[PDB]
């Protein structure tokens, strides 16, 4: 649109919002490069919270604590795993690929909003999914492109 914070988000009853808006990410966001291994979701979240990659494992620990105490709120994780114990053992391993399951949990665990912007190779939004009630400008904006996750920041 004209302002990212004026996008129209459509919630489902699970509290996940979707947006059909289609624009080019790089007209509104600066991208940042993180190393392209299987930890990139966690590198990206760490970059946006701390301006450093070094906190990526502790973000996993925060997710794990939420999954242990609040498994019934881990809606997407419950589709993929029989119990919180199985989930935590898998997610905590190196090169576990983060995605919507972790975005949903982290948004609740840290009281932040996380947006997964699925992009094609030319950086056009294909799907946008927002976890949490907040606005684009306050969210952790993640670009999902060609199997890798990179942090985005609002331009200027």
Residue numbers in the entry: 3 to 158
What does the primary publication say about this deposited structure?
One specific mechanism used by nairoviruses is the production of a deubiquitinating enzyme, termed the vOTU, that disrupts the innate immune response. Interestingly, the nairoviral L segment also encodes a viral homologue of the ovarian tumor protease (OTU) at the N-terminus. Instead, the vOTU’s primary function appears to be the reversal of post-translational modifications by ubiquitin (Ub) and the Ub-like protein interferon stimulated gene product 15 (ISG15).
The vOTUs from DGKV, QYBV, and TAGV readily crystallized and were solved to 1.62 Å, 1.65 Å, and 2.05 Å, respectively. DGKV vOTU, consistent with its low Ub-AMC activity, possesses very low activity for the di-Ub FRET substrates, regardless of the linkage. In DGKV vOTU, aspartate is replaced by a glutamate that alters the spatial dynamics of the catalytic triad, possibly contributing to a less rigid structure that allows the histidine to adopt the alternate conformation. While atypical for the vOTUs, it does not appear to be the cause of DGKV’s low DUB activity, as mutating the glutamate to an aspartate only further diminished activity. In DGKV vOTU, Trp73 packs with the methylene group of Ser86 on one side and the aliphatic portion of Lys80’s side chain on the other. Lys80 itself is stabilized in this permissive conformation by hydrogen bond pairing with the carbonyl of Gly74. Interestingly, changing the pocket in DGKV vOTU failed to improve activity. This suggests that some vOTUs lacking any outright DUB activity may have evolved to a degree that prevents the generation of this activity through simple changes to better accommodate Leu8 in Ub.
